[model samples]
Target: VNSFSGYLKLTDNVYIKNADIVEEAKKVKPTVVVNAANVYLKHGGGVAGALNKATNNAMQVESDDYIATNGPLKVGGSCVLSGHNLAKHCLHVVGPNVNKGEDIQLLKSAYENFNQHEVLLAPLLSAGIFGADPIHSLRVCVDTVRTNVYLAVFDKNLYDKLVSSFL
Candidate 1:
């Protein structure tokens, strides 16, 4: 699984890919930050990459800035964009394709630090994917970690358990 074995002390906290990284990330602080991933250019993030033949085959991109799929974002991409709209180097780590389990583990380890911030945002897995639905997995994972905090919700059509804030 993606959990670090004995670090989290929770069952569902385990993952399949990167439990170590998740364990290490527990030390990071979570403050008000814009959490977004799976961001596509020409969308709410940035201008779409140019259409090309080599790398653009999938997304049809022709710019060096635009490589193949925006799977796990490389280092510095965030910095460059964040520069245009600078935000504090807060504890917001958005990893593309982070559903394997690592993301949840780290979220569980140090979710408290992240909640202290002014805002919290994250694109739920399978929010709009083809056949994979991570919502059930997401619910299970969060349940294992929420005891550290209290999780509630206002409106959701997928699952239940979250409270209605009625905001």
Candidate 2:
């Protein structure tokens, strides 16, 4: 556990949290949780991977079907999955891949496409292997929040940045 019970407010709609994201997801129980998926949907190592694994590979099966029917999922594109262990629905958003030239536009579209939701849970998109500034995507996510938003902080560096940037 990260030992932070309270939340750091980034905006009226956006809030940062520490501790276990899975445990917190079960507790907060948002309408939907956003997964930072990729076009390949092969990288199984981010928060999305954790969620997928936690749910016993439900998202992967769904992703396979989603990609099979729609062709490759583009960055910034989104797909909704039925419930497994988290919420009623899980929204998968393909984030930027730097080597593939996936840019902030993908991040923008992901946030923009999800703006109508009442509640959402999201990880730091493009902050890891995708290689974009976490702060920048965090700003885009802040705008996506509507009624409620829970932004999971996985790294101490990310947690610190979110705290300082907002406060």
Candidate 3:
């Protein structure tokens, strides 16, 4: 179970880590941590919920305030806000819901947004409740992420699969 618990380099700057994103984000203290957000920017479950609790729900407040002013995030779009706890900032990106329609470009776009940051902590975007296949999601992420990225994989099975695929 601990075989893939640390970092596996994908490229000179990109890596995959089998760890909880919230804990890793605090340790790595990346410039920003990417949230696998819904279009509404709600932080009720998954990575968003963990981050919300880590920041004592300040992220939710900021997310609410952001939506109130800027409107709901469009699929493949992103919004950035002060992190309040784990890192300097938090970047929320709405991944395409594959249950509705699998749009590879939208998933690519979500990963592309990471290029703006020097260092980032990101989850497996669209691979959870959004219904994206984990291997495909990781491929898209590896292709599009330009920053120094630590891609956190919380699930043991998926982490092993992704690591196996990358190797």
Predicted structure 2, TM vs. truth: 0.85
lDDT agreement with native, every candidate? 0.27, 0.72, 0.83
Worst 10 residues of 2 by lDDT: 1-10
Per-residue CA lDDT of model 1 for 1-167, tens digit only, reads: 22122222223222222122212223322122222223333222211111111122332222124424344343212311321112223232232334443343333323333334333322232223212244443444354333222121112443232212111
Which wins on TM-score, candidate 1 or candidate 2?
2
Q: In candidate 3, where is summed lDDT lowest over 10 consecutive residues?
A: 1-10
TM-score of each: 0.28, 0.85, 0.90
Top candidate (TM-score): 3
Q: Arrange candidates by TM-score, highest first: which order?
A: 3, 2, 1
Q: Per-residue lDDT tens digits of candidate 2, residues 1-167?
A: 22224787677777787645666667766678777778766538877678878788887887788778888777787777764787788877787877577667778776775676766777777777678878887877776546566778778777887678763
User: For model 1, what is the alpha-carbon lDDT of residue 121?
Assistant: 25
